[PDB]
């Protein structure tokens, strides 16, 4: 009755308790979906016929500050794994430390950047030390959840498309592998995932560690598995991320891949007897600052719908039933009715009201106190890992005639700055789009620049993503010293509430939900007609970034967990560009709750 | 600030705190809908723009046995009124004692029939005494809820189409009115409702009591209110039951009235400035034995959908929005989004299994013990106010050749009997349909007859509705003595579970519902493909009668309140005619849970 799971090289498969085995898995990120709904998605996953999941452990989700760890409630990954086990699902764990995943900085904590020249995903001694410490914290929590110790964990990913990274460090991989073996034991099954081309496996694979690839419908399947077999002559064929859809970018049209094309490809993969994981099965949500970025800079939106088999709000889609039908070819699917798409409710129009700009509330926003520096400091340099940062200086010259805010020594404003002087908004600045802007003000006037972190790049080489001013800020090639920066405690500020482009300002509105209705509150979608861009919280929960005027995302997912009946619902919007709220028309100064999402 | 509500004869209206007032009400029966959902319907009623409700107090719902009263939880009418008041809705109370309402025996308790020749709705001293006692119990509970005492009760109905009853007793009405004035005070506003023809008001109205009529879309509105004015020259015009739809009968096709026809008529009524109540606004449910009957006998089904503006399960229908739109012509409608149609879930097919016939379980069904009588006793005579009754005797003659079960002295088998001998089902008997049946058995064989109460007549003269055998049971005009009757405690029996027509037998099946799903359990509809007729309980809650083979009702409403997650769901079906469960096909021996009702 002992649980003996191990790769069967002879018969190119897995063996579970002596029986041939191959897994049909789907990715689910417990962190892009609220814990309130975890069971739901996982049960749907079981009802789809998957027998395993493939999930990432984002290091930054559990250690926002060095040595500070969060693992309870919404932070309780171990409970998530235990719940999956209770549902009869196996688990493929992917603990990184880099996960990509269109997630902030690939999971790595921003405070790593406190060493300016430090190198991530390399043999950098400080990087390796921090990685080791994180592993020494995380992995003992996973140890009792390993299959051979009676839990659902059957295989473990060590990296993610490591062949795409510039370093090509095999000492780094060896160091990771030694530490994983040390903390987790020799029994664990360790694997890699890389792009389906031998060039990437060249720098990704490693001895004493199984090698796998990923690929979607636009790859020769034969060629892909031939590429894998060139690195793993014996053992199961595995596609760890067979893409069912694709990520989005703001402005870029929403990617859509036909359902039945994915279905046909999936059938083809299954017919070879391989192991496939559907990335993503549910996409979930890009919370406040969890989004990543590519290069050339292009942040991912709030919605992570992904065109996944389960929609952002968990709806059963035609894709879901198609994939269930395909999977039922190769395994009996669980009996019983499938949990439904959640109910949606249109709460309708809710009004807001100008509360205060960031500048006029920094003390409430930053009650510990501000930061002073000779030259500007970056987001990391000011010890604010997310959010927005206020840069303040004095004008050294009279600017009665519009003077040009222009280049800095090496084009290092990232990623967006809203510029103003003594509460007079001057316009916008951004990377690759707008770096020059005429401004006006008297000599000695207070210049305030609000810098937004639009997301740390999550893929490629450009992980040294400073965020804000690093270099000597210059106006018309004229230097600027004596800077005061302001980190903003937006989360506690929203949770407490002190208890013609419009300057970044807060608009607070309320709405009530009746008590005693069994099927209220329900999940919903928030729309911002007439707004431009900002951040939104409900009852202190940061739902993420909105940008309807840029699109393609319009609605934001609102999980019903955050609404409280009888007690007033208190929405706070931080608008960065424009609000319909100056004139005498109040109806325009409203957001809306809708039932059917509109994201593309 | 004193609350002064009274009829304004001068200006043909009501006055509320000195202001002209007319009400736009809808009927809601707190008892045909589970308390779990009361708020829901009432809030929808508020969102429809109604400012009052018109509801019945069924005497039999609160006093099933003489001197035994139930008023807590699901029995807490006073809490229902208080909840309505809390929602800002006024209340029109209609406490009967007869309510018609397609409800059992017009609300009157069946034990009144323990006096065989007693007369209901007359000056019968025992009837008047029982009525008085009921009023003396009920009305002091309503007193603090009266408008002038700070509650939502503004007017009170004393009868219901009294002009349709044969007695034409004005002493009876005077007695009621005196008792109502005595217990409730002179301040109360008292009114009547009758069919819209002077002939009925002739016997319905009464001095010192306001007179109103009811009528639907097939009545001359001018003529109807002229008829009212002939009895009330001054005061508001009132239609207390403007029918938006109609009741159903088993077998009779489901009545449907076009939405917009009702809308046009409603607008016409409103334009006269009258007071109108929409009967029904929600219909709700016909539980276990709460249905009524007409003459010639025709029981109402389980569904009381009524084609009401709110569907049986509370869905917003095109009729609802149409009526809201009409009402918004004459009054501002409440602000905010309207509570939605409830979510529905298809739990799918659930199997059952033959447990035991009634005969083989009477001890468990009747643990106090059976009844013995020289000649058969009626349902009332055996002190079982609902349910089914077992009649047992011995065959006095050899019946090797089929002998005719035939007439009794005055055709008094009501309403349906399933006949068998020692567990050999012989067929069916019913009133006006089948009273003759050939049977076979040896002399001295035990003859068991299972008699179903299909519903006590709720309208007309025929309230002396015995239910079962009253007269000397005869086979081929041959008398039968030495009877043993068996009252069945079906409710406690289901709640405990001891912890080719098929004989009436119990089939128990289970189904499980996953835990941790925020939007599960949901309301549902149960279907019985292949079954014929019987009673169904879930977790001991008697959902009512099913009869798909007769129709028009197929599905049964299942409110989500009765489902319990993790704990097994235990459905019990008492089938009276036929089950698909003898052969080796188990799939046929299943009921189904569906999401969309199919009732017509
Ligand atoms: C910002 O300007 C200061 C001006 O002093 C720079 O500081 C000097 O930079 C030169 C190179 O440009 C070095 O050789 C000196 O050693 C620096 N001196 C000090 C005291 O730091 C600074 O490097 C500039 N930084 C940026 C990012 O432009
Ligand atoms: C949303 O705003 C309402 C309005 O103040 C809050 O309701 C009060 O919250 C305070 C907490 O600071 C309590 O002390 C009061 O008792 C609450 N009012 C009542 C009538 O009880 C509500 O708490 C706010 N919600 C959130 C999530 O902050
Ligand atoms: C059932 O049969 C019995 C037979 O005795 C009837 O009892 C007699 O009925 C006659 C009228 O038919 C009366 O005059 C007698 O006074 C009754 N005698 C007794 C002792 O009751 C009885 O009435 C019959 N009942 C029915 C409903 O048919
Ligand atoms: C439905 O049937 C199940 C199966 O027995 C019941 O579950 C048990 O109920 C008994 C009560 O007699 C408890 O003592 C047991 O502890 C229950 N089982 C477990 C595992 O806890 C369930 O109670 C039944 N439901 C209803 C409403 O009768
Ligand atoms: C893939 O490539 C192999 C050889 O390179 C070829 O035989 C096969 O037909 C190709 N299939 C597809 C779908 O491109
Ligand atoms: C910017 O600086 C240059 C110095 O060469 C000066 O000539 C120019 O006038 C400045 N710009 C403005 C708008 O004054
Ligand atoms: C900047 O700060 C230094 C610190 O002493 C001060 O000497 C200098 O005058 C300041 N310059 C301006 C422009 O405020
Ligand atoms: C919500 O805020 C508005 C702002 O005027 C206020 O009128 C309203 O009463 C508030 N809602 C509740 C339930 O108090
Ligand atoms: C109703 O009857 C009155 C007089 O009896 C008549 O004037 C009116 O036109 C009738 N209206 C309808 C709708 O029958
Ligand atoms: C019924 O009773 C009559 C008595 O007149 C008898 O003649 C007849 O045979 C009986 N019926 C049967 C089926 O025996
Ligand atoms: C009916 O009961 C009486 C009561 O004593 C008994 O005398 C009689 O024999 C019984 N008759 C039958 C047919 O059982
Ligand atoms: C429900 O009853 C069936 C009858 O065989 C049984 O197999 C099943 O285990 C029961 N369900 C649960 C959850 O125990």
Short mmCIF file of N, CA, C and O in Angstrom, two decimals, chain A residues 370-465:
data_model
loop_
_atom_site.label_atom_id
_atom_site.label_comp_id
_atom_site.label_asym_id
_atom_site.label_seq_id
_atom_site.Cartn_x
_atom_site.Cartn_y
_atom_site.Cartn_z
N UNK A 370 7.99 61.14 5.32
CA UNK A 370 8.49 61.13 3.94
C UNK A 370 9.98 60.81 3.86
O UNK A 370 10.63 60.55 4.88
N UNK A 371 10.52 60.83 2.65
CA UNK A 371 11.92 60.53 2.39
C UNK A 371 12.56 61.74 1.71
O UNK A 371 11.92 62.41 0.90
N UNK A 372 13.81 62.01 2.05
CA UNK A 372 14.55 63.11 1.44
C UNK A 372 15.82 62.57 0.80
O UNK A 372 16.45 61.66 1.34
N UNK A 373 16.20 63.14 -0.34
CA UNK A 373 17.36 62.66 -1.08
C UNK A 373 17.92 63.78 -1.94
O UNK A 373 17.17 64.61 -2.47
N UNK A 374 19.25 63.79 -2.08
CA UNK A 374 19.90 64.77 -2.95
C UNK A 374 19.43 64.64 -4.40
O UNK A 374 19.03 65.63 -5.02
N UNK A 375 19.46 63.43 -4.94
CA UNK A 375 18.95 63.20 -6.28
C UNK A 375 17.76 62.26 -6.17
O UNK A 375 17.57 61.66 -5.10
N UNK A 376 16.92 62.11 -7.19
CA UNK A 376 15.74 61.26 -7.03
C UNK A 376 16.16 59.81 -6.80
O UNK A 376 17.18 59.34 -7.29
N UNK A 377 15.34 59.11 -6.02
CA UNK A 377 15.47 57.68 -5.80
C UNK A 377 14.38 56.91 -6.53
O UNK A 377 13.28 57.42 -6.77
N UNK A 378 14.68 55.66 -6.88
CA UNK A 378 13.72 54.80 -7.56
C UNK A 378 12.70 54.26 -6.57
O UNK A 378 12.85 54.36 -5.35
N UNK A 379 11.63 53.67 -7.13
CA UNK A 379 10.65 52.96 -6.32
C UNK A 379 11.31 52.01 -5.33
O UNK A 379 10.97 52.00 -4.14
N UNK A 380 12.26 51.20 -5.80
CA UNK A 380 12.97 50.32 -4.88
C UNK A 380 13.82 51.12 -3.90
O UNK A 380 13.81 50.85 -2.69
N UNK A 381 14.54 52.12 -4.41
CA UNK A 381 15.41 52.93 -3.55
C UNK A 381 14.64 53.60 -2.43
O UNK A 381 15.22 53.89 -1.38
N UNK A 382 13.35 53.85 -2.62
CA UNK A 382 12.55 54.48 -1.57
C UNK A 382 11.76 53.44 -0.78
O UNK A 382 10.95 53.78 0.08
N UNK A 383 12.04 52.15 -1.02
CA UNK A 383 11.47 51.07 -0.21
C UNK A 383 9.96 51.02 -0.36
O UNK A 383 9.23 50.76 0.60
N UNK A 384 9.48 51.28 -1.57
CA UNK A 384 8.08 51.05 -1.91
C UNK A 384 8.06 50.11 -3.11
O UNK A 384 8.43 50.50 -4.22
N UNK A 385 7.62 48.88 -2.86
CA UNK A 385 7.72 47.81 -3.84
C UNK A 385 6.63 47.85 -4.88
O UNK A 385 6.74 47.17 -5.90
N UNK A 386 5.58 48.64 -4.66
CA UNK A 386 4.46 48.73 -5.58
C UNK A 386 3.93 50.15 -5.52
O UNK A 386 4.64 51.07 -5.12
N UNK A 387 2.68 50.33 -5.94
CA UNK A 387 2.02 51.60 -5.72
C UNK A 387 2.57 52.72 -6.58
O UNK A 387 3.04 52.52 -7.70
N UNK A 388 2.49 53.93 -6.04
CA UNK A 388 2.91 55.15 -6.73
C UNK A 388 3.77 55.96 -5.78
O UNK A 388 3.70 55.80 -4.56
N UNK A 389 4.61 56.81 -6.35
CA UNK A 389 5.57 57.57 -5.56
C UNK A 389 5.51 59.04 -5.94
O UNK A 389 5.43 59.39 -7.13
N UNK A 390 5.51 59.91 -4.93
CA UNK A 390 5.49 61.35 -5.15
C UNK A 390 6.91 61.90 -5.12
O UNK A 390 7.64 61.69 -4.15
N UNK A 391 7.31 62.58 -6.19
CA UNK A 391 8.60 63.26 -6.27
C UNK A 391 8.36 64.76 -6.19
O UNK A 391 7.56 65.30 -6.95
N UNK A 392 9.05 65.43 -5.28
CA UNK A 392 8.81 66.85 -5.08
C UNK A 392 10.14 67.57 -5.15
O UNK A 392 11.14 67.12 -4.57
N UNK A 393 10.15 68.71 -5.84
CA UNK A 393 11.30 69.60 -5.81
C UNK A 393 10.81 71.04 -5.94
O UNK A 393 9.61 71.31 -5.94
N UNK A 394 11.76 71.97 -6.07
CA UNK A 394 11.48 73.38 -6.27
C UNK A 394 12.00 73.77 -7.65
O UNK A 394 13.06 73.29 -8.07
N UNK A 395 11.28 74.64 -8.34
CA UNK A 395 11.75 75.11 -9.64
C UNK A 395 12.94 76.06 -9.47
O UNK A 395 12.83 77.05 -8.74
N UNK A 396 14.07 75.79 -10.11
CA UNK A 396 15.25 76.64 -9.92
C UNK A 396 15.25 77.87 -10.81
O UNK A 396 16.07 78.78 -10.60
N UNK A 397 14.37 77.91 -11.81
CA UNK A 397 14.30 78.99 -12.77
C UNK A 397 12.85 79.41 -12.95
O UNK A 397 11.93 78.60 -12.78
N UNK A 398 12.65 80.68 -13.29
CA UNK A 398 11.32 81.14 -13.68
C UNK A 398 10.88 80.42 -14.95
O UNK A 398 11.64 80.31 -15.92
N UNK A 399 9.65 79.92 -14.95
CA UNK A 399 9.10 79.27 -16.13
C UNK A 399 7.81 79.95 -16.55
O UNK A 399 6.81 79.28 -16.82
N UNK A 400 7.82 81.29 -16.62
CA UNK A 400 6.66 82.01 -17.13
C UNK A 400 6.36 81.63 -18.57
O UNK A 400 5.20 81.46 -18.96
N UNK A 401 7.40 81.50 -19.39
CA UNK A 401 7.23 80.88 -20.69
C UNK A 401 7.40 79.37 -20.58
O UNK A 401 8.21 78.90 -19.78
N UNK A 402 6.60 78.60 -21.33
CA UNK A 402 6.63 77.14 -21.16
C UNK A 402 8.01 76.55 -21.38
O UNK A 402 8.54 76.59 -22.50
N UNK A 403 8.60 76.02 -20.34
CA UNK A 403 9.90 75.41 -20.46
C UNK A 403 9.77 73.90 -20.64
O UNK A 403 8.83 73.28 -20.12
N UNK A 404 10.69 73.28 -21.38
CA UNK A 404 10.54 71.85 -21.73
C UNK A 404 11.07 70.93 -20.63
O UNK A 404 12.27 70.91 -20.34
N UNK A 405 10.16 70.16 -20.03
CA UNK A 405 10.57 68.93 -19.37
C UNK A 405 10.96 67.93 -20.45
O UNK A 405 10.19 67.66 -21.38
N UNK A 406 12.16 67.38 -20.33
CA UNK A 406 12.79 66.71 -21.45
C UNK A 406 13.63 65.56 -20.92
O UNK A 406 13.41 65.08 -19.81
N UNK A 407 14.57 65.11 -21.75
CA UNK A 407 15.42 63.96 -21.45
C UNK A 407 16.05 64.06 -20.07
O UNK A 407 16.24 65.15 -19.51
N UNK A 408 16.38 62.90 -19.52
CA UNK A 408 17.28 62.75 -18.40
C UNK A 408 18.53 62.10 -18.99
O UNK A 408 18.52 61.78 -20.18
N UNK A 409 19.61 61.90 -18.23
CA UNK A 409 20.86 61.45 -18.87
C UNK A 409 20.74 60.15 -19.65
O UNK A 409 21.41 60.03 -20.69
N UNK A 410 19.92 59.19 -19.23
CA UNK A 410 19.80 57.97 -20.02
C UNK A 410 18.36 57.50 -20.11
O UNK A 410 18.09 56.29 -20.08
N UNK A 411 17.40 58.43 -20.25
CA UNK A 411 16.03 58.07 -20.61
C UNK A 411 15.45 57.06 -19.61
O UNK A 411 14.99 55.98 -19.96
N UNK A 412 15.49 57.46 -18.34
CA UNK A 412 15.15 56.59 -17.23
C UNK A 412 13.95 56.95 -16.40
O UNK A 412 13.95 56.72 -15.19
N UNK A 413 12.93 57.55 -17.01
CA UNK A 413 11.62 57.68 -16.37
C UNK A 413 10.74 56.51 -16.78
O UNK A 413 10.47 56.30 -17.97
N UNK A 414 10.28 55.74 -15.79
CA UNK A 414 9.49 54.53 -16.01
C UNK A 414 8.47 54.39 -14.90
O UNK A 414 8.82 54.51 -13.72
N UNK A 415 7.21 54.12 -15.25
CA UNK A 415 6.80 53.96 -16.63
C UNK A 415 5.88 55.10 -17.05
O UNK A 415 5.66 55.32 -18.24
N UNK A 416 5.33 55.82 -16.07
CA UNK A 416 4.40 56.89 -16.38
C UNK A 416 4.48 57.92 -15.26
O UNK A 416 4.53 57.56 -14.08
N UNK A 417 4.50 59.20 -15.63
CA UNK A 417 4.52 60.29 -14.66
C UNK A 417 3.46 61.34 -14.97
O UNK A 417 3.37 61.81 -16.10
N UNK A 418 2.67 61.68 -13.97
CA UNK A 418 1.72 62.79 -14.05
C UNK A 418 2.36 64.01 -13.40
O UNK A 418 2.71 63.97 -12.22
N UNK A 419 2.52 65.08 -14.17
CA UNK A 419 3.35 66.22 -13.77
C UNK A 419 2.45 67.39 -13.39
O UNK A 419 1.46 67.68 -14.08
N UNK A 420 2.79 68.07 -12.29
CA UNK A 420 2.01 69.22 -11.86
C UNK A 420 2.89 70.12 -11.00
O UNK A 420 3.96 69.73 -10.54
N UNK A 421 2.41 71.35 -10.79
CA UNK A 421 3.09 72.33 -9.95
C UNK A 421 2.06 72.98 -9.05
O UNK A 421 1.15 73.66 -9.54
N UNK A 422 2.21 72.80 -7.73
CA UNK A 422 1.29 73.36 -6.74
C UNK A 422 -0.17 73.07 -7.09
O UNK A 422 -1.04 73.94 -7.00
N UNK A 423 -0.44 71.83 -7.49
CA UNK A 423 -1.80 71.43 -7.77
C UNK A 423 -2.33 71.91 -9.10
O UNK A 423 -3.55 72.02 -9.27
N UNK A 424 -1.46 72.20 -10.05
CA UNK A 424 -1.86 72.55 -11.41
C UNK A 424 -1.37 71.45 -12.34
O UNK A 424 -0.18 71.43 -12.70
N UNK A 425 -2.23 70.53 -12.74
CA UNK A 425 -1.78 69.40 -13.58
C UNK A 425 -1.25 69.89 -14.92
O UNK A 425 -1.84 70.75 -15.57
N UNK A 426 -0.13 69.30 -15.33
CA UNK A 426 0.56 69.74 -16.53
C UNK A 426 0.52 68.71 -17.65
O UNK A 426 0.83 69.07 -18.80
N UNK A 427 0.13 67.48 -17.37
CA UNK A 427 0.07 66.45 -18.38
C UNK A 427 0.85 65.22 -17.98
O UNK A 427 1.16 65.01 -16.80
N UNK A 428 1.17 64.41 -18.99
CA UNK A 428 1.63 63.04 -18.80
C UNK A 428 3.01 62.87 -19.42
O UNK A 428 3.45 63.65 -20.26
N UNK A 429 3.69 61.81 -18.97
CA UNK A 429 4.97 61.39 -19.53
C UNK A 429 5.03 59.88 -19.45
O UNK A 429 4.53 59.28 -18.49
N UNK A 430 5.64 59.24 -20.45
CA UNK A 430 5.76 57.79 -20.42
C UNK A 430 6.91 57.35 -21.31
O UNK A 430 7.44 58.13 -22.11
N UNK A 431 7.29 56.09 -21.16
CA UNK A 431 8.45 55.55 -21.84
C UNK A 431 8.09 55.10 -23.25
O UNK A 431 7.08 54.41 -23.45
N UNK A 432 8.90 55.53 -24.22
CA UNK A 432 8.76 55.23 -25.65
C UNK A 432 7.61 55.99 -26.29
O UNK A 432 7.43 55.94 -27.51
N UNK A 433 6.83 56.72 -25.49
CA UNK A 433 5.67 57.42 -26.03
C UNK A 433 5.79 58.93 -25.90
O UNK A 433 5.72 59.63 -26.91
N UNK A 434 5.99 59.46 -24.69
CA UNK A 434 6.03 60.91 -24.47
C UNK A 434 7.04 61.20 -23.37
O UNK A 434 6.81 60.86 -22.21
N UNK A 435 8.15 61.84 -23.73
CA UNK A 435 9.17 62.25 -22.77
C UNK A 435 9.40 63.75 -22.73
O UNK A 435 10.20 64.22 -21.92
N UNK A 436 8.72 64.52 -23.57
CA UNK A 436 8.85 65.97 -23.62
C UNK A 436 7.50 66.62 -23.34
O UNK A 436 6.47 66.16 -23.84
N UNK A 437 7.52 67.70 -22.56
CA UNK A 437 6.28 68.37 -22.20
C UNK A 437 6.60 69.79 -21.73
O UNK A 437 7.45 69.97 -20.86
N UNK A 438 5.92 70.77 -22.30
CA UNK A 438 6.09 72.15 -21.87
C UNK A 438 5.31 72.40 -20.58
O UNK A 438 4.15 72.00 -20.45
N UNK A 439 5.96 73.06 -19.62
CA UNK A 439 5.37 73.34 -18.31
C UNK A 439 5.53 74.82 -18.01
O UNK A 439 6.33 75.53 -18.63
N UNK A 440 4.74 75.30 -17.05
CA UNK A 440 4.75 76.71 -16.69
C UNK A 440 4.62 76.87 -15.18
O UNK A 440 3.78 76.22 -14.55
N UNK A 441 5.45 77.74 -14.61
CA UNK A 441 5.32 78.10 -13.21
C UNK A 441 6.40 79.09 -12.82
O UNK A 441 7.40 79.26 -13.52
N UNK A 442 6.18 79.74 -11.68
CA UNK A 442 7.13 80.72 -11.19
C UNK A 442 8.34 80.03 -10.56
O UNK A 442 8.27 78.89 -10.11
N UNK A 443 9.47 80.75 -10.55
CA UNK A 443 10.66 80.26 -9.88
C UNK A 443 10.39 79.98 -8.41
O UNK A 443 9.72 80.76 -7.72
N UNK A 444 10.91 78.86 -7.92
CA UNK A 444 10.69 78.42 -6.56
C UNK A 444 9.38 77.70 -6.33
O UNK A 444 9.12 77.28 -5.19
N UNK A 445 8.55 77.54 -7.35
CA UNK A 445 7.31 76.80 -7.21
C UNK A 445 7.58 75.32 -6.96
O UNK A 445 8.55 74.75 -7.45
N UNK A 446 6.69 74.71 -6.18
CA UNK A 446 6.81 73.30 -5.84
C UNK A 446 6.35 72.46 -7.02
O UNK A 446 5.19 72.53 -7.43
N UNK A 447 7.26 71.65 -7.56
CA UNK A 447 6.96 70.74 -8.66
C UNK A 447 6.74 69.35 -8.08
O UNK A 447 7.64 68.79 -7.43
N UNK A 448 5.54 68.80 -8.30
CA UNK A 448 5.17 67.46 -7.87
C UNK A 448 4.96 66.56 -9.07
O UNK A 448 4.17 66.87 -9.97
N UNK A 449 5.64 65.41 -9.06
CA UNK A 449 5.56 64.41 -10.11
C UNK A 449 5.06 63.12 -9.47
O UNK A 449 5.68 62.61 -8.53
N UNK A 450 3.95 62.60 -9.97
CA UNK A 450 3.39 61.35 -9.47
C UNK A 450 3.77 60.23 -10.42
O UNK A 450 3.34 60.21 -11.58
N UNK A 451 4.59 59.29 -9.95
CA UNK A 451 5.15 58.24 -10.79
C UNK A 451 4.42 56.95 -10.46
O UNK A 451 4.33 56.56 -9.28
N UNK A 452 3.91 56.30 -11.49
CA UNK A 452 3.20 55.04 -11.38
C UNK A 452 4.09 53.88 -11.80
O UNK A 452 4.71 53.93 -12.86
N UNK A 453 4.13 52.84 -10.98
CA UNK A 453 4.72 51.58 -11.39
C UNK A 453 3.67 50.83 -12.19
O UNK A 453 2.69 50.32 -11.62
N UNK A 454 3.86 50.74 -13.50
CA UNK A 454 2.90 50.07 -14.36
C UNK A 454 3.14 48.58 -14.44
O UNK A 454 2.43 47.89 -15.18
N UNK A 455 4.11 48.06 -13.70
CA UNK A 455 4.42 46.64 -13.64
C UNK A 455 5.87 46.33 -13.99
O UNK A 455 6.39 46.75 -15.02
N UNK A 456 6.52 45.59 -13.10
CA UNK A 456 7.90 45.18 -13.35
C UNK A 456 7.92 44.10 -14.42
O UNK A 456 7.13 43.15 -14.37
N UNK A 457 8.81 44.26 -15.40
CA UNK A 457 8.91 43.29 -16.48
C UNK A 457 9.07 41.88 -15.93
O UNK A 457 9.84 41.64 -14.99
N UNK A 458 8.33 40.94 -16.51
CA UNK A 458 8.29 39.57 -16.03
C UNK A 458 8.97 38.59 -16.97
O UNK A 458 9.04 37.40 -16.65
N UNK A 459 9.45 39.04 -18.12
CA UNK A 459 10.02 38.15 -19.12
C UNK A 459 11.11 38.87 -19.88
O UNK A 459 10.96 40.04 -20.25
N UNK A 460 12.21 38.16 -20.14
CA UNK A 460 13.27 38.68 -20.97
C UNK A 460 14.51 38.97 -20.14
O UNK A 460 14.70 38.41 -19.06
N UNK A 461 15.35 39.86 -20.65
CA UNK A 461 16.52 40.28 -19.90
C UNK A 461 16.22 41.44 -18.97
O UNK A 461 16.76 41.51 -17.87
N UNK A 462 15.33 42.35 -19.39
CA UNK A 462 15.16 43.61 -18.69
C UNK A 462 14.43 43.42 -17.37
O UNK A 462 13.30 43.89 -17.20
N UNK A 463 15.07 42.74 -16.43
CA UNK A 463 14.58 42.63 -15.07
C UNK A 463 15.10 43.75 -14.18
O UNK A 463 14.57 43.95 -13.08
N UNK A 464 16.13 44.46 -14.61
CA UNK A 464 16.61 45.64 -13.89
C UNK A 464 15.72 46.85 -14.17
O UNK A 464 16.13 47.85 -14.76
N UNK A 465 14.48 46.73 -13.73
CA UNK A 465 13.38 47.61 -14.12
C UNK A 465 13.23 48.55 -12.93
O UNK A 465 12.55 48.24 -11.95
#
